[PDB]
Amino acid sequence: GGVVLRVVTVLEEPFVMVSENVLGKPKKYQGFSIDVLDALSNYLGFNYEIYVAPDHKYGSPQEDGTWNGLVGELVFKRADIGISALTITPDRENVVDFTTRYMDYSVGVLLRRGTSIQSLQDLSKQTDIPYGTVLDSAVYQHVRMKGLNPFERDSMYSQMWRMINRNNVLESQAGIQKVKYGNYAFVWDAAVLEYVAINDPDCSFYTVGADRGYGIALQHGSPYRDVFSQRILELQQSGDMDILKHKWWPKNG
Ligand SMILES: [Cl-]
Ligand code: NA
């Protein structure tokens, strides 16, 4: 009778993916973050049940200072653990506690084959192909912060903020669909976009693009954080974290 921890997530390939099911046979989740979660579950002896953030968002600080999304679920005490493709950021570290990272994060751009965008810089220099990101996400917040900083050294960020300031989507799937079928470029996690590009049945895409990382979020003060971070470091040191990565990014495009 191990305690059942409530895990809040956002669906996002290949980090957390569902298998939908029929006739009362249980819905199951899989992916890189589920494997890491499982490695931790097996170690602490907890069970868990997963639910998706009700608003389908990662979360960002709102006009009135409250948090929504996955990060908000933690702040509002609705969950014990938050895990997805969740980017560790200083603003989020203000209201929840992150583990050490279990994988590096970077920003990429998903583009339709036949376009001629070779860099995030080129993308920002035009307005013809419209572009954007997922609302209430770390990308949105980062582009805003850098784009509004007069002392930012790369002028691309100000150009991006002009375009993005709410061209955005509610969920990454919508952004991917817009690139595929419309006239759009989608700015999102490189790890997600690499997986999407290499697995697209039509090879419709290419991508262009480690100072931030993916982390497990816990309520502030949680006694799981140190224990998790220890287990994460162990997994990295042994090569086991790399084995997990290769399972989900076996880069064979
Ligand atoms: Cl979701
Ligand atoms: Na914190």
Cα of 150 vs centre of ligand 1, distance in Å, is 34
The DSSP output letter for 54 is T
The answer to whether residues 225 and 206 belong to one domain is no
Q: Which two tokens stand for residue 250?
A: 């076996």
Q: What share of the chain is helix, strand, coil (3-state, %, to 5)?
A: 35, 20, 40
Same domain? For 136 and 253 the reply is no
Claim to verify: residue 99 and residue 218 sit in the same structural domain: yes
Instruction: Give the dihedral sign, CA 81/86/87/90.
Output: negative
212 contacts: CB under 8 Å, gap ≥ 6 = 87, 88, 89, 101, 104, 105, 106, 138
Q: Are residue 97 and residue 194 in the same domain, yes or no?
A: no
Question: Does 221 lie in the same domain as 200?
Answer: no
Judge if 187 and 160 occupy the same domain: yes
Task: Collapse the DSSP code of 238 into the 3-class scheme (helix H, G, I; strand E, B; otherwise coil) and give the result.
Answer: helix
Spacing, Cα 56 to ligand 1 middle (Å):
4
* CA 229 – ligand 1 centroid, Å: 25
Where residue 118 sits, what CATH number does that domain have?
3.40.190.10
Please say which residue of 196, 211, 226 terminates a domain: 211
For β-strands 81-82 and 4-9, DSSP reports them as parallel
* Those residues with Cβ within 8 angstroms of residue 77's Cβ, 6 or more apart along the chain or in another chain: 219
First to last CA, the chain: 44
- φ, ψ dihedrals at 236, nearest 5°: -65, -50
Domain containing 99 equals 1-105+212-253
- Is the preceding omega at residue 14 within 30 degrees of 0, hence cis? yes
Instruction: Looking at the structure, tell me whether residues 81 and 121 fall in a common domain.
Output: no
Q: Which two tokens stand for residue 179?
A: 């690139």
Which residue type is seen at 155? Answer: S
Kindly identify the ligand whose nearest atom is closest to the C-alpha of 170.
1
Instruction: Give the environment of ion ligand 1: residues with CB less than 5 A.
Output: 10-11, 52, 56
For this PDB entry, the determination method is X-ray
Ligand 2 centroid from CA 115, angstroms = 42
Please tell me the distance between residue 121's alpha carbon and the centre of ligand 1 in angstroms.
Answer: 29
For the chain, the domain total comes to: 2
Single-letter residue type at 177: Q
Q: Of 17, 8, 141, 14, whose CA–CA distance to 69 is shortest? A: 8
Can you tell me the distance from the alpha carbon of 146 to that of 155, in angstroms, rounded to the nearest whole number?
Answer: 9
State the distance from the centre of ligand 1 to the C-alpha of 10, rounded, in angstroms. Answer: 4
Ion ligand 2 neighbours, Cβ < 5 Å: 93, 97
Query: Are residues 93 and 1 part of one domain?
Result: yes
